């Protein structure tokens, strides 16, 4: 006598919020941006190729100085490249070989890396000796992790496959706050430039927004049919993109709380592996698992260019903090810096 | 090139030397994925060939190292983490079973990896286990051998 009434209340709430959303959907981004001059054909060449890995590359991350990038792989080796010179700075061996993601502290002091072992171990780069030692092992996640990101040298936000994101404290090693709003597994994270909100792409085709201090779902976005496999904030911090298996990017907005514009092409019938914006929020690089990534436009869905220098699919990609270049870790154990 | 940059290059070269040594050491290993119902003697046959996270088993048979990753430890959704195990020589199956077989037989990422099927109680190979584990290990080693033949022939362009 209670389930039916609450379910009907939830249905009514969904209907009224969807009507409120549709109320301000009078305009579309395409006709707004039809007047502005398109960028045109963009040619991005593989400036450098970092080799030394011997297995599929699952993730990478640039440092804040945008010169060092740490890349993980199946062989259980964590490598801190020097993008400018393509010479190693460190080569950290991992306890397990199933690392799905890496990270990088904003100060550059600490490095994190996690995977199927349900641990996001934080490494201590600048120690008194010349070897990188594990500094902590954050346990408490029921399932596997997929993205742990560093707020600062002392706060890290994880995102595990047990439908749960947590905010840990490094010295204590325990989660101060827990974010339990998702139903499916979580596959992405993007800390906002002001480091106050983040959006995680779940398996239920819904991406939620949270508050790092409160611990509640501020907003919730739908519009996909398959699991969301990528997430990337707009440089201003008011928009984010969603990459899903349905071969279609989807730009959202925090203030509007609605889809803003779609990115679809029929010739691509393969899913999305990772999405990364540019410095100015104009080019939406999206890496599909059809063995080549391509460059889009954030305003008029113009497939400006394609990065097709990779033997296998592009798994993870990222952009520098100064916008000078992008890199694409692929499944042939190659990192390529495109500029 | 200053002294500091040259010494950094030398350190990087030592790093590549160590990485290449480890890669050559670990290339001779072969990875296998254990997948099945979980209560049909999977641990039994695992201990037969033996003589949080995912259970890992290691053993050598004949100048070749086998790594056997048991997945029964984790009961999460099978499809979501299947993207990590896309590159594996073979999957050993020990006999919802029919649905699991149908799902794994037409996986998009498993269109090249063969499936090894065991009856205790891409090409698919089958064998009926006996008391002597030597026959079963011979069968699995042979099947991995044909998998390696196929991979090498594809690489060289003949296949």
């Amino acid at each position, epitope marked *: 006598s209670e389930l039916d009434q609450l379910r009907q209340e939830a249905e009514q709430l969904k209907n009224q919020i969807r009507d409120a959303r549709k109320a301000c959907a009078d305009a579309t981004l395409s006709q707004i941006t039809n007047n502005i001059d398109p960028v045109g054909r963009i040619q991005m060449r593989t400036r450098r190729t970092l080799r030394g890995h011997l297995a599929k590359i699952y993730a990478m991350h640039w440092g804040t100085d945008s*010169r*060092l990038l740490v890349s993980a792989s199946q062989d259980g080796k964590l490598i801190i490249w*020097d993008s400018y*010179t393509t010479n190693k*700075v*460190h080569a950290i061996p991992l306890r397990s070989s199933w690392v799905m993601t890496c990270a990088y502290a904003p100060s*550059g002091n600490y490095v994190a890396c996690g995977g199927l072992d349900n641990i996001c171990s934080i490494y201590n780069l*600048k120690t*008194r*000796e*010349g*070897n990188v030692r594990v500094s902590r092992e954050l346990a408490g996640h029921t399932g596997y992790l997929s993205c742990c990101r560093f707020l600062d040298d002392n706060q890290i936000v994880t995102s595990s496959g047990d439908t749960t994101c947590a905010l840990w404290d490094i010295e204590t090693g325990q989660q101060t706050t827990t974010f339990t709003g998702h139903t499916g597994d979580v596959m992405s994270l993007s800390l906002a430039p002001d480091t106050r909100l983040f959006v995680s792409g779940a398996c239920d085709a819904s991406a939620k927004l949270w508050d790092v201090r409160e611990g509640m779902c501020r907003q919730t976005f739908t519009g996909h049919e398959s699991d969301i496999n990528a997430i990337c904030f707009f440089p201003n911090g008011n928009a984010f993109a969603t990459g899903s298996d349905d071969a279609t990017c989807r730009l959202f907005d925090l203030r509007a709380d609605q889809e803003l514009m779609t990115y679809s092409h029929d010739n691509i019938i393969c899913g999305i592996t990772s999405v990364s914006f540019s410095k100015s929020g104009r080019l939406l690089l999206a890496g599909y698992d059809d063995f080549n990534c391509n460059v889009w436009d954030a305003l008029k869905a113009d497939r400006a260019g394609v990065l097709a220098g990779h033997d296998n699919r592009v798994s993870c990609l990222g952009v520098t903090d100064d916008g000078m270049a992008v890199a694409t870790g692929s499944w042939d154990s190659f990192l390529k810096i495109w500029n | 090139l*200053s*002294a*500091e*940059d040259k*010494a*950094a290059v*030398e*350190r990087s070269k*030592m790093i590549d030397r160590n990485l290449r040594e480890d890669g050559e050491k670990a290339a001779r290993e072969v990875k296998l994925l254990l997948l099945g119902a979980g209560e049909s003697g999977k641990s039994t046959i695992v201990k037969q060939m033996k003589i949080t996270g995912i259970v890992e088993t290691h053993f050598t048979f004949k100048d070749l190292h086998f790594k056997m990753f048991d997945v029964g430890g984790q009961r999460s959704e099978r499809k979501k983490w299947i993207h990590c195990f896309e590159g594996v020589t073979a999957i050993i199956f020990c006999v919802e079973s029919m649905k699991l077989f149908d799902s794994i037989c037409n996986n998009k990422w498993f269109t090249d990896t063969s499936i090894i099927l065991f009856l205790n109680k891409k090409e698919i190979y089958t064998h009926f286990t006996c008391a002597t584990d030597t026959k079963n290990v011979q069968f699995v080693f042979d099947a991995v051998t044909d998998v390696i033949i196929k991979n090498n022939l594809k690489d060289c362009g003949l296949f």
Partner: single-chain antibody
Amino acid sequence: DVQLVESGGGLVQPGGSRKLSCSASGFAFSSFGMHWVRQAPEKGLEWVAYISSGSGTIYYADTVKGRFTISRDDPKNTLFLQMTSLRSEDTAMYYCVRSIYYYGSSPFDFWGQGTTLTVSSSDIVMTQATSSVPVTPGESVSISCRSSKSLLHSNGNTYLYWFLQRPGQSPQLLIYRMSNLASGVPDRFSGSGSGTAFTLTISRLEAEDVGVYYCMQHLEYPLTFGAGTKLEL
């Protein structure tokens, strides 16, 4: 804690041969490079030798080339210096310094205690015109030393270092690459410069900062130090 204890020396006849066993107890040794810094009695520092990581690079000073050899024993964490034909000017104190090279590293971070050696009886040149600066605590003092050639490189960093040698103590690093600060030093120290004119500024003098300041270049070997400038209360 990090330590580098060396041994040997004490009395040598001219033309002889001795051995110094510099040991780093309980820390990484194969990753670090090592140099040999010899200090003539009541004189400044003078670079002697340097063996790289993996013994793939070995460099001697031009004044000891062919007479000195430097070797390392990684498994037992020892560093060796074989001297041949020990002349009269080789009597000095010999230190052991660690130096690890990578992007963002701080070479010459730690210095050994030093064992004296007694004998019975081109390159970048860097000058410190000032010798003694008697300054009471509390007021900033500027120490400057100039290089013959610009230490700046096409990379954009200048390889000039500053060391503080407290009386009766081994020198320690506090400024590497003319701008940065070594870990474990107060923020009051700060340096600057451009090309050839280098300066060091201390915010305020303490009781423990009294000592002698050295500056050394590191673009290419040999690495010439500078005549130390002493400051007193």
